[PDB]
Design an enzyme around this catalytic site. Structure first.
Site, PDB file in Angstrom:
ATOM      1  N   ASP A  53      43.292  59.668  55.740  1.00 40.51           N
ATOM      2  CA  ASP A  53      41.887  59.811  55.360  1.00 40.51           C
ATOM      3  C   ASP A  53      41.012  59.601  56.605  1.00 40.51           C
ATOM      4  OD1 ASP A  53      39.266  59.217  53.755  1.00 40.51           O
ATOM      5  OD2 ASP A  53      40.745  59.698  52.201  1.00 40.51           O
TER       6      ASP A  53
ATOM      7  N   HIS B 169      34.934  56.340  53.397  1.00 45.87           N
ATOM      8  CA  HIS B 169      35.769  56.929  52.361  1.00 45.87           C
ATOM      9  C   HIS B 169      37.184  56.365  52.412  1.00 45.87           C
ATOM     10  CE1 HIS B 169      38.145  60.148  50.422  1.00 45.87           C
ATOM     11  NE2 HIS B 169      37.095  60.229  49.623  1.00 45.87           N
TER      12      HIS B 169
ATOM     13  N   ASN C 230      37.990  68.516  43.341  1.00 40.87           N
ATOM     14  CA  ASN C 230      36.763  68.253  42.603  1.00 40.87           C
ATOM     15  C   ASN C 230      35.947  69.502  42.290  1.00 40.87           C
ATOM     16  OD1 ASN C 230      37.407  65.543  43.060  1.00 40.87           O
ATOM     17  ND2 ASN C 230      36.017  65.383  44.804  1.00 40.87           N
TER      18      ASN C 230
ATOM     19  N   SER D  14      39.567  61.811  44.776  1.00 42.23           N
ATOM     20  CA  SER D  14      39.951  60.925  45.861  1.00 42.23           C
ATOM     21  C   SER D  14      40.025  59.470  45.411  1.00 42.23           C
ATOM     22  CB  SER D  14      38.962  61.080  47.015  1.00 42.23           C
ATOM     23  OG  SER D  14      37.649  60.723  46.624  1.00 42.23           O
TER      24      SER D  14
HETATM   25  N1  LIG Z   1      39.634  71.279  55.536  1.00 44.52           N
HETATM   26  C1  LIG Z   1      40.043  70.145  54.712  1.00 44.52           C
HETATM   27  C2  LIG Z   1      38.984  69.042  54.700  1.00 44.52           C
HETATM   28  O1  LIG Z   1      38.429  68.715  55.703  1.00 44.52           O
HETATM   29  N2  LIG Z   1      38.657  68.402  53.438  1.00 44.52           N
HETATM   30  C3  LIG Z   1      37.664  67.345  53.391  1.00 44.52           C
HETATM   31  C4  LIG Z   1      38.097  66.234  52.427  1.00 44.52           C
HETATM   32  O2  LIG Z   1      39.003  66.349  51.655  1.00 44.52           O
HETATM   33  N3  LIG Z   1      37.354  64.999  52.445  1.00 44.52           N
HETATM   34  C5  LIG Z   1      37.747  63.939  51.537  1.00 44.52           C
HETATM   35  C6  LIG Z   1      37.357  64.356  50.130  1.00 44.52           C
HETATM   36  O3  LIG Z   1      36.357  65.104  49.975  1.00 44.52           O
HETATM   37  O4  LIG Z   1      38.034  63.940  49.150  1.00 44.52           O
END
Ligand SMILES: NCC(=O)NCC(=O)NCC(=O)O
Ligand SMILES: [Ca+2]
Ligand SMILES: [Ca+2]
Length: 278
Positions: free
Chosen positions: A39, A69, A161, A224
């Site tokens: 993450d 996050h 999401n 997440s």
């Molecule tokens: N290109 C893949 C990326 O950067 N996704 C962003 C991400 O997953 N951030 C955490 C989230 O939004 O859950």
């Protein structure tokens, strides 16, 4: 053990019904297991981690969680007050920058790092990886997640999401990993949660209180937030010895609360993560 006035999602993973507030769990609490949080990083100095968190890899010029996050997700895995597995070891792999963004090459590199690193760590009860991230479909991303699973790591990934079918996103669409949807406190699939045949399990994901950077706390929502509930539950079950990384997702699915959820499209599992305590 019993944690009164726990965050609602912790209470929910130890109850057969919604609306309770005590989290009941075996005191072993995931000791001797390890969870890699892939993450934005983890604020290891946060008192809620009790020294059990360590950054092990970054793909950027710092390993600091400059976003929050990753620290939030790690807290749901294993912090004292907000965590499922309150004594597990947490390892941070920073694949997302401080805006929460990352290239697929970096996400793949991070997964490959965990695949080759985890046998060099003190994790006698087993190893989990929590991927609270995703993007559009990619065969290479799915392949790296599948190889990480095959290296002996219980891989849990967010469904996404978009309120859409998770088969169009990666690593959510990789069948061999554990793909986690999100629910709210009334046992409804969360408004934003993806769905579909590729989902293995649901866990709490709407309004989840956990650690935040600066030694603080924050309540946020998303798949997440559901993923680290499952990652922590896997660590907890692996410490109890009831499953191992290879079978953990299937075991969690088979021991889940079944049929309790609403807003579940026909064809998607109706399974809510559950620790079967008491
Ligand atoms: N290109 C893949 C990326 O950067 N996704 C962003 C991400 O997953 N951030 C955490 C989230 O939004 O859950
Ligand atoms: Ca029920
Ligand atoms: Ca699966």
């Amino acid at each position: 053990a019993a944690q009164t006035n726990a965050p609602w999602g912790l209470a929910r993973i130890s109850s057969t019904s919604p609306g309770t507030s005590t989290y009941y769990y075996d005191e072993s609490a995931g000791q001797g297991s390890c969870v890699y949080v892939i993450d934005t990083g983890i604020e290891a100095s946060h008192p809620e981690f009790e020294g059990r968190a360590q950054m092990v890899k970054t793909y950027y010029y710092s390993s600091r969680d400059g976003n929050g996050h990753g620290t939030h997700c790690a807290g749901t895995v294993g912090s004292r007050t907000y965590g499922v597995a309150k004594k597990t070891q947490l390892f941070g792999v920073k694949v997302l920058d401080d805006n929460g963004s990352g290239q697929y090459s970096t996400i793949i590199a991070g997964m490959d790092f965990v695949a080759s690193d985890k046998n060099n760590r003190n994790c006698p009860k087993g190893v989990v990886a929590s991927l609270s991230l995703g993007g559009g479909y990619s065969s290479s991303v799915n392949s790296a997640a599948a190889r990480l699973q095959s290296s002996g790591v219980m891989v849990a990934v967010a469904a996404g999401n978009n309120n859409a079918d998770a088969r169009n996103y990666s690593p959510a669409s990789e069948p061999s990993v554990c793909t986690v949807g999100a629910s709210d406190r009334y046992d409804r699939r969360s408004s934003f949660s993806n769905y579909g045949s590729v989902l293995d399990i649901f866990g709490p994901g709407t309004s989840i209180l956990s650690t935040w950077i600066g030694g603080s706390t924050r309540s946020i929502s998303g798949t997440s937030m559901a993923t680290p509930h499952v990652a922590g539950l896997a660590a907890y079950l692996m410490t109890l010895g009831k499953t191992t990384a290879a079978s953990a997702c299937r075991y969690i699915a088979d021991t889940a609360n079944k049929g309790d959820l609403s807003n579940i499209p026909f064809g998607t599992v109706n399974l809510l993560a559950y620790n079967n305590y008491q």
